[PDB]
RNA sequence: GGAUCCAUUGCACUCCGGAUCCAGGAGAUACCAUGAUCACGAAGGUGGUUUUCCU
């Protein structure tokens, strides 16, 4: 009830968004004087209310007198003086008395990646196909067949690839865990020539409904080869 | 942000009521698809799913 630099306005329409409300209060209330600020919140405690801070108390007093009851967004404005000085008034007077989520996130990706690289590095030095009991015979006579139907039998496969020449050995690969087939095999020919021939002619060959992929064995032939699980591999189905 | 419902007439100046759902944004997803080319396996990315923020 005692005059003040700041006026308090309530009974405001609660549907109106914050900037709109600040805007429309500025338009209406500058007519009475210089405004330092209009404070609005739409929180539970503060919605329906505004503090208009004027430079002079006299503007405040005239703004209060004139606008009392004024129709504003289909609602009469209720205006009083603020009970207490607004911080910027009080400081003007010397009356005044009192990892982000973006960082935690970025750090976490960074560590997973690094953690991953170390894992791969460690596996890598466990990896040696020349010392694997599964990898036998002449690498240079060995074909690599992937994308096989899980249903395809070792027979059907030996049949399809025998056309290119006598086969010394087939090793289809199974999960050491489930024992489910991995969809790939090594086929060692008697003669390098016949492997080369399967290589030229069998790629894309349809066996049990699925186009198979045919390549040479690279594990034991290609300088610097790493398999897909060690960050290498060929093919591009899942590049992005 | 927005839609519906509910609560609120509140004196602040450190965001910030509830519910259910929607759009965009940014996270996260253990699960599904992509049946990933090297002897059981990438990670992830992309598309789902679920979920947490922001508007
Ligand atoms: Mg090695
Ligand atoms: Mg998968
Ligand atoms: Mg994946």
Numbering used by the authors: 6 to 103, 126 to 267
From the manuscript:
60–216 of U1-70k via Gly–Ser linker. stem-loop I and U1-70k in detail, illustrating a new mode of RRM-RNA interaction. (A) Interaction of stem-loop I with U1-70k RRM. (A) C33 and G34 embraced by U1-70k loop 3. and A32 stack onto Phe106 and Phe148 residues of the beta sheet. loop is closed by a trans WC/Hoogsteen base pair formed between A29 and A36. strand the bases A35, A36, G37 and G38 continuously stack. along with A29 and Arg190, continues the helical stacking of the stem. (B) Interaction of stem-loop II with U1-A RRM. detailed RNA-protein contacts between U1-A RRM and stem-loop II.
Crystal structures of the two sub-structures of U1 snRNP. molecular details of 5′SS recognition by U1 snRNP. intricate network of interactions between the components of U1 snRNP. insights into the molecular mechanism of 5′SS selection.
